[PDB]
Amino acid sequence: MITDSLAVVLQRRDWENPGVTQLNRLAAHPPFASWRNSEEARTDRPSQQLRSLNGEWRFAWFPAPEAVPESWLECDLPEADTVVVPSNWQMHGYDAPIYTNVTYPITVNPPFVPTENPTGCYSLTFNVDESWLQEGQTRIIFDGVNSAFHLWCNGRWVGYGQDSRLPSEFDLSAFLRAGENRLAVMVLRWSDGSYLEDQDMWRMSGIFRDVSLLHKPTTQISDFHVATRFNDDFSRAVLEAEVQMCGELRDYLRVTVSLWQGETQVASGTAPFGGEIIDERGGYADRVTLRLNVENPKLWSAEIPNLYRAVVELHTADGTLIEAEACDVGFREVRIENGLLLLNGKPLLIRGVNRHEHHPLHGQVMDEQTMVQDILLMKQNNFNAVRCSHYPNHPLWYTLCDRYGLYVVDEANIETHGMVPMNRLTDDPRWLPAMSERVTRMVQRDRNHPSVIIWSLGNESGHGANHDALYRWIKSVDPSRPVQYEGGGADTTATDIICPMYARVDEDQPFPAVPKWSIKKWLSLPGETRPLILCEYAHAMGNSLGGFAKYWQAFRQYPRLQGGFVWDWVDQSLIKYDENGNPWSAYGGDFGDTPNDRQFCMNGLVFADRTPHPALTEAKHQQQFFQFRLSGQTIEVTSEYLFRHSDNELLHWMVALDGKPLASGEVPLDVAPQGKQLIELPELPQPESAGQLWLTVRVVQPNATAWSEAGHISAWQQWRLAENLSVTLPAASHAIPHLTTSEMDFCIELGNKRWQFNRQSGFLSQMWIGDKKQLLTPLRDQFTRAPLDNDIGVSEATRIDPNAWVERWKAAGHYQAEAALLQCTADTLADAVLITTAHAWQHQGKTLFISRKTYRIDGSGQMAITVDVEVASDTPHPARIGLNCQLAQVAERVNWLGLGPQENYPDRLTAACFDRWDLPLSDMYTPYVFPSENGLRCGTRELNYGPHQWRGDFQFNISRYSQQQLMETSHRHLLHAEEGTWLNIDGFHMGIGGDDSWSPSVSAEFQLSAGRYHYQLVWCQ
Amino acid sequence: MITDSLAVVLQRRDWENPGVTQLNRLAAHPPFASWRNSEEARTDRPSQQLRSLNGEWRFAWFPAPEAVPESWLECDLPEADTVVVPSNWQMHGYDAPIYTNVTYPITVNPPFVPTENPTGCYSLTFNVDESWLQEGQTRIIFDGVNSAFHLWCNGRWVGYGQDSRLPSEFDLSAFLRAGENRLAVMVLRWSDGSYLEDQDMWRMSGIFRDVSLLHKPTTQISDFHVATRFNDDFSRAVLEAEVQMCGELRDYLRVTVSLWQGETQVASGTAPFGGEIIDERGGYADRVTLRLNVENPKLWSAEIPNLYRAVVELHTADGTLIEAEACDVGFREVRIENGLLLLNGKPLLIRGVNRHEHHPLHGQVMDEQTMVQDILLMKQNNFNAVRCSHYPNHPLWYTLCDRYGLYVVDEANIETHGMVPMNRLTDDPRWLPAMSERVTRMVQRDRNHPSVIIWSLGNESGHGANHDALYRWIKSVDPSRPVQYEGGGADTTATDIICPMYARVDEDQPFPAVPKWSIKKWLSLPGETRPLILCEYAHAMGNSLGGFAKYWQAFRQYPRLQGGFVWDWVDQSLIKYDENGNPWSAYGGDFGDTPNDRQFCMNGLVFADRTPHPALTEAKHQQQFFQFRLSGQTIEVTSEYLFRHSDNELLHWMVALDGKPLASGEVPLDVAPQGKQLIELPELPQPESAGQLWLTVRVVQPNATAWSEAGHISAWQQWRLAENLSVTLPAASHAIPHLTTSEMDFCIELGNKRWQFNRQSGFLSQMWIGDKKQLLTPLRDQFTRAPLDNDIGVSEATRIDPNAWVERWKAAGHYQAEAALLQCTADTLADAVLITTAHAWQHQGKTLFISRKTYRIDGSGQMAITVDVEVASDTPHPARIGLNCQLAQVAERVNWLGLGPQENYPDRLTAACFDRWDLPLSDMYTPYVFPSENGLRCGTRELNYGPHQWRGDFQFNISRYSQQQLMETSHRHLLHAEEGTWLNIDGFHMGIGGDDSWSPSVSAEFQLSAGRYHYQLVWCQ
Ligand SMILES: [Mg+2]
Ligand SMILES: [Mg+2]
Ligand code: NA
Ligand code: NA
Ligand code: NA
Ligand code: NA
Secondary structure: HHHOOOOHHHHOOHHHOOOOOOOOOOOOOOOOOOOOOHHHHHHHHOOOEEEEEEEEEEEEEEEHHHHHHHHHOOOOOOOOOOOOOOOOOOHOOOOOOEEEEOOOOOOOOOOOOOOOEEEEOOOOEEEOHHHHHOOOOEEEEEEEEEEEEEEEEEEEEEEEEOOOOOOOOOOOOOOOOOEEEEEEEEOOOHHHHHEEEOOEEEEEEEOOOOOEEEEEEEEEEEEEEEEEOOOOOOOOOEEEEEEEOOOOOOOOOOEEEEEEEOOEEEEEEEOOOOOOOEOEOOOOEEEEEEEEEOOOOOEEOOOOOOOEEEEEEEEEEOOOOEEEEEEOOOEOOEEEOOEEEEEEOOOEEEEEEOOOOOOOOEEEOOHHHHHHHHHHHHOOOOOEEEOOOOOOOOHHHHHHHHOOOOOEEEEEEOOOOOOOOOOOOOOOOHHHHHHHHHHHHHHHHHHHOEEEEEEEEEOOOOOOOOOOOOHHHHHOEEEEEEOOOOOOHHHOOOOEEEEEOOOOOOOOOOOOOOOOOHHHHHHOOOOOOOEEEEEEEEOOOOOOOHHHHHHHHHHHHOOOOOEEEEEEEEEEEEEOOOOOEOOOOOOOOOOOOOOOOHHOOOOOOEEEOEEOOOHHHHHHOOOOEEEEEEEEEEEEEEEOOOOOOOOOEEEEEEEEEEOOOEEEEEEEEOOOOOOOEEEEEOOOOOOOOEEEEEEEEEEEEEEOOOOOOOOOEEEEEEEEEEEEEOOOOOOOOOOOEEEOOOEEEEEEEEEEEEEEOOOOOOEEEEEEEEEOOOOEEEEEEOOOOOOOOOHHHHOOOOOOOOOHHHHHHHOOOOOEEEEEEEEEEEEEEOOEEEEOOOOOOOOEEEEEEEEEEEEEOOOOOEEEEEEEEEEEEOOOOOOOEEEEEEEOOOOEEEEEEEEEEOOOOOEOOOOOOEEEEEHHHHHHOOOOOOOOOOOOEEEEEEEEEOEEEEEEEEEEEEOOHHHHHHHHHHOHHHOOOOOOOEEEEEEEEEOOOOOOOOOOOOOHHHHOOEEEEEEEEEEOO | OOHHHHHHHHOOOOHHHOOOOOEEOOOOOEEEEEOOOHHHHHHHHOOOOEEEEEEEOOOOOOOOOOOOOOHHHHHOOOOOOOEEEEOHHHHOOOOEEEEOOOOOOOOOOOOOOOOOEEEEEEEEEEEEHHHHHHHHEEEEEOOOOEOOOEEEEEEEEEEEEOOOOOOEEEEEEEEOOOEEEEEEEEOOOOOHHOOOOOOOOOOEEEEEEEEEEEEOOOOOOEEEEEEEEOOOOOOOEEEEEEEEEEOOOOOEEEEEEEEEEOEEEEEEEEEOOOOOOOOOOOOOOEEEEEEEEEEEEEEEEOOOEEEEEEEEEEEOOOOOOEEEEEEEEEEEEEEEOOOEEEOEEOOOOOOEEEEOEOEEEEEEEOOHHHHHHHHHHHOOOOEEEEEEEOOOOOHHHHHHHHHHOEEEEEEEOEEEOOOOOOOOOOOOOOHHHHHHHHHHHHHHHOOOOOOEEEEOOOOOOOOOOHHHHHHHHHHHHHOOOOOOOOOOOOOOOOEEEEEEOOOOOOEEOOOOOOOOOHHHHHHHOOOOOEEEEEEOOOOOOOOOOOOOOOOHHHHHHOOOEEEEEOOEEEEEEEEEOOOOOOEEEOOOOOOOOOOOOHHHHHHOOEEEOOOOOOOOHHHHHHHOOOEEEOOOEEEEEOOOOOOOOOOOEEEEEEEEOOOOEEEEEEEEOOOOOOOOOEEEOOOOOOOOOOEEEEEEEEEEOOOOOOOOOOOOEEEEEEEEEEEEOOOOOOOOOOOOOEEEEOOOOOOOOOOOEEEEEEEOOOEEEEEEEEEEOOEEEEEEEEOOOOOOOOHHOOOOOOOOOOOOOHHHHHHHHOOOOOOEEEEEEEEEEOOOEEEEEEEEEOOOOOOEEEEEEEEEEEOOEEEEEEEEEOOOOOOOOOOOOEEEEEEEEOEEEEEEEEEEOOOEOOOOOOEEEEEEEEEEEEHHOOOOOOOOOOOOEEEEEEEEEEEEEEEEEEEEEEOOOOOHHHHHHOHHHHHHOOOOEEEEEEEEEEEOOOOOOOOOOOOHHHHOOOOEEEEEEEEOO
């Protein structure tokens, strides 16, 4: 037929028209399986009426839709390959994925898209049983197609669809034939729907979610809604189920809804069709509402995800079953009352994270195994909520969240971040239909899931009248869930919750017309009463999450600060192979994509392979459900659970003196929700030996759960007990170090040890143990670090951001400053040799820093170093103040007394505990995909590496990579281990920040602004 | 091109798809003229850039779209006729118009329409000047096409459109050629848009509004909005004008907005493009907002429609004009505060009427002359508001309302009355795009008109979530106007005003789920605070508007009862010609249309030719802006104007004794808005003669206005002054009437007069003056009337409504009751002859009525009749209790002392005044298109017709048509004058009702429920 040809179908250019978002697409609805057996529906066994078309398909790539030959509609192309479906065709190397943050990947000219529009032609040959075509309705379901597509069946045009993130269904009953059938799908990379899909993520395309065939009878269940109502104390519930049908109504038709708790039927109801009168013309003859009473229902929550099974039966009066549908039911009430978000009558505290659907190998194709891995990792790290940023997810995600227990914010697939202004489309009534489809079809698909507690209207689209209209539509159709939206300043008329992104705890950010007030100040603005839940905060880009504890202190102090969603869960890195088949993680620009936003795609708490970043432990500690207070010998344990008793918790305490255990014990936890338990410790040891006594408590779950193993640690806390200062005089050795003075250097010898101080540079240049040199590079002051992602921000060589810390440091000359020797003197004491040095670091005639040191080598072989540094008040505050050297030794393990075991920084050390830690050298380096300063351990009093030992009170990192190499290397796989080991010992280190990664975010109390600094070290063997 | 062919264009069947409401249609906007001269824009002179295509077109009718030959796209069909455009093709006899009230004219199966879909093919050959195609944009504008259409230009497909009531615009720049061009428009009668167009009106089709070409420059004004803000006392105003452009932005571009009051420029402003920052991405570079201060602005209102002229200039910095646009500006503020609708700080009282766009000859094609005639008639009858029921009107209507002064409710073209339930579509998200287009494009077109004070979401579509969404969209885009909607019970979340239809003053109507509470009770329902303005009330079907005074008493007593809109203005009758070219008014079913709703299309206050019905005077009197109170000799005049002083009003008073004037005078009116004026009358005459003194006042406008002639009467009132009862004995004549008794009759003779009473029937059978018989039918009791439309309701022979008054009367046998003579006796008195009669009216053995009479013929020739009637308490209350006869006389004039001059009934007589009235016999018959009881005059003490005179206290009507003929005749043109004159003299008459015309609406105080009745008459010559 001419009308089925490509020349006719493509002529209207439906993908450059916001007025046409679909053609011949069926209505949205909750998940259906069309069970013909009620027991199978109840037990959720696979349905023979639902058939997966996933598997091997034929695929051909074209640069534009006009390049597809007409013969593709009739037979498979000879050049076509065989590919796995679902998939993204960028993951098969057909064209490159594009990573851009805010700028659209195409020329901004709505609704038009470039003529060179990459086109993917999918096709499948499949058989259909004759029973399916004898009677009933056969539909095909595309769970997701990016970004738009035309559909042919046996050469006849079927329909068109947009909104890559929601299912598209088409009736194939009039197109299918008995035996062999062929499906032809033409997928377009760009469409007018792409203007509503400007999320900060990789831009891919293809049939990236499941494809299936569903067979329904002619008389069928077409929609069903489940609602729960409760009394004041939640002891009585009414389960209201509205069922809708299509087909011929007959007086013998009946609907039965039965509720099951496991194997036991709790409630049931049967009724003929015909609803109550609603207006002058009557009621719905094709609908019925059944109300089931449930006594003492088991309530659903993230703490205890109690679920019931509701089965909806369509049957005749005699008793023969026509069709069955089922869904999991969670009894829970969500509402905002007096400014607080309540779940089952109790105020929530959202321990949330944003999660994109990302896999380093399969792109944006999701699988049950990855979903379960993510959910278990989140729950094991004290997360209780997830934001579907920024689109409806794969349908199995909501089922798994129902089952395991996580609150879900379901978000419409609308983001127009790149528009200027941001609301240019969302304030235009001509785009209201397209926006409305994306909201309404999501609600229609997901409104039955108990895990979904909040709807979101999208992300970063400004504030337009369409937002207000769709907010009100949701409030009318589903009053059971609050609606939130951040655009337009996060407190507009289109949101029930103040939901800002990256608003800071105490600091105001008064931007024009969309200020980000401090969250504490925001609550008290005149006339403001809503709760505040950050939809994004604590931007976890690289070495980040500095200041997380401040957020959680505020969340616990202020009732209307009910938490937030960290940005974000997993790095969006992709895997590439070099010349040796070795994989390496890639970010923006690594696929030839341009313009790109480089490493801003990696903001996760876990790597793309789901291994954790160090910041995850900080998040876990701050988000823990047990809070602790110490008063003398008693421990006060406060529970932050709202519904469950501590029936799987054992408290273990340990007392150690500078790392060596002295006493320990175990006490079972029995604390009610939001209750307290006082734990009286026995008479703790009081050693007369010098050192600090430390008490450490940890909560252990003795029994495995659905989401954790036996012995899982869920919370911990540490305190300092009594301290005994050391007043013992050092052992007076009889040997005296010998000083030899040449015009080049001072040489100090004691036994087999030797120290050399270069007199022209003023630094310790070499150290000998026997005849073995210990240093590859002299011991020198260091004031800089390889810049973090938070240090760099949005700055780059093309667009310099002068406010970024790295740019201020570079302009001030911190990285190029040259040390000028001021003095270097050697003196012999009664029992030691004293070296005094002074240096000035200068850049273009300006003295940035002055370092004055004293080296005291005594008869015991120990070298005591005192450092006093002055920092010019008008230079930017330095990243660190310390020493560094390249040791010749390469040892296998690192042992230290201090905060650990994981890397920690001054504004990100609350999760770390003081103890004796011993790790392999490799664990002392954090392999961030974008290399930077990493692996620091703070609060360290002793460090052991090979024969060397350093003592004092310092921060350190130790690795095979110099700060220079880390700074100059753009990818972690390009790093090479240098000879020996680089040691950085810092008296002082600046915070890492992380409130956001595009502006300075290190709070004042963690900047090195004091002007004068002092620290001491003891180096011995 | 194959893609331009009918076979390809019609294949997608865009008219059976709610997802496609247009293709390639330009954005909506306020009216544009693209003036290239600012003085021409200011003076509103015709623009050479706007060209009307109205005139002679070629037209061909087809039964279905598939019947149109392909050659129509290239050349005009040989069989095509030449027709005038705009027009409705049913008005040219191509197919029949259909009148149905609620039932859809097609099978209800959305979105599908019948295959036999009448199709009208329009075409026009026109020239285009080469200057228009050298540069700029040329667009075609279809102001209205019913109901959907495809457009071709020079054989190339252009686009598609729906929503018959709003303009559709298409860019023809790439399709036009120099010289001869051809336009081809295929209009379809039915589409999926028809499901949203179920208004109670004739169903027509075609290009029924103007068609024009507009030429714009490439850089152009694309939209402009005008908003007025005020201080607390309205003495300072800020005129805010937002201007939007399309085309290439250049730094030299400027926009100037100037405000003019007649010939004087009041304010001006100039600015380059670029708006303020609105969100993170910036502001609109293609928009500018200019704020002009106006001191002491002249405010707009229906009382004083002060208007300014705003001119919007697009020009370069040097000063050359690119384009100009203009609109009339009315400074006024509309808001609801504390439950009251306020205009310029004062609470409105809406004297409204619903108005369809209807013409008896041109169907639904409107013209300026008819619009002006309607506006003048409305204002002359004390109306101040109009509801555009139920769709956006022709654009000139809003301009005329701005100019003359009338508040306007602008209503979206959405009515789904026939759906079951009524919200089946409006609660479906799949119809949200189609509904949103109809709301948003109306707002975009009309938001600048000062006369529009309220938006309406449509009519009778139930209540669905789409209503709430669109309500909120309007509230977001245009906060300056309240939003109202009646569906779903008239007090839903989608309306700012309680706006019920046909809610009664005191009586509750508690329907399930959508009750119509009495309006007084509705205001005080727990938690209700909004104002109440009936969107429809006082259904004026035929002889109706009984009980109107009750509504207006309530409106004046209750502050939150702020009026309503009468249903409706003009009868929707159409003109047909019989076998002699004589026109006659036709209603539903007269065109072969079936099923139809007969005479329910005629509900107007005026006939289709705009001649008034009698009820219009009642409305005018009740709605008058001056209220009166009498206390002794002083008249208290209260002004109901809110803004204007009574600077064009003179009060005339007159005192009459039983119709003859005794004193009169004139007093100028000087009363402030909402003020009072006491008028002291001189020492009024005190005649000793018998009779009732009546005081009549009338307010006269000495000076002509824009809407009225000099001497126009705007208000009036009457009171009874002192009465002197007659105690004079009658003149004792010496002649004695002579009684002759035969077995057939009693014969009374006095001089040349003779009376005959038939002794077998018991009635006066004949009367002689000389040798001339005076009666054609005997004088007999009458208890029935030819049923009114309010008596009939929805009852018909196929579907009997047992509750209707006519059905109750028929079932009780009132129309078939047979009089049985009980007694008939003649006695001779000292100076008179006495006749005593008694009758019983029985039906199937039940005595319905008993009448006992006394006839006393004295020596003066007068016949005194006393009547005493008993009505069975269990029979339905009769329509009247009186006498009737057929006089042989046909006299030219009727003279009576009583209420007049126009027809009046017991519940519709407040406008009538007691006086001596003299009219031709023809004026005593009201020619309702559907014949019924008509022409009654109440409160009559004397009636003169030919030689006869009747005296007493009675109601009467007199005409050439019997009640039987009126009852049995369905159209007024089928009535024939009977021989002689039919007289109905009633002691008592039932009210006519009219709160609605589909249920009994006559209030209890106007039903004849007393059980016993007495009245007396004196018949003399
Ligand atoms: Mg489109
Ligand atoms: Mg359509
Ligand atoms: Na809180
Ligand atoms: Na990012
Ligand atoms: Na009132
Ligand atoms: Na009607």
